[PDB]
Amino acid sequence: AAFRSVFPIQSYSGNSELQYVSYRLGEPVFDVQECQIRGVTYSAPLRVKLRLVIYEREAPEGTVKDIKEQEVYMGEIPLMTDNGTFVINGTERVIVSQLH
């Protein structure tokens, strides 16, 4: 929902847009037994398939100029262990709820 709300964003002059296809969560580089040792965040790299399209200038509705589709890395997200304990900088952290 957070991707589909923002994307697809277009150019300012209305000649291009970034289309969104899908995302994919890669494998964690380290396990939880050594993130508590080396002091690093137990996370998973987040990748996303983005599609950039170029619309023609003189054409009324011209999509056929080029289709650029590439996989983009953007940050990480910290995973959750099997009990609800995020591992941030080696120390196990718990996010409580909120009542608003």
The answer to whether the beta carbons of residues 47 and 26 sit under 8 Å apart is yes
Q: Which is nearer to another protein, 34 or 66 (CB)?
A: 34
For another protein, the binding residues (CB under 8 A) are: 26, 29, 37-38, 41, 45, 72-78, 83-86, 88-89, 91-100
Q: Which is nearer to another protein, 33 or 98 (CB)?
A: 98
The answer to whether the beta carbons of residues 66 and 74 sit under 8 Å apart is no
CB of 15 to another protein, least distance (A): 21
Measure the CA–CA gap between 76 and 27, rounded to whole angstroms: 11
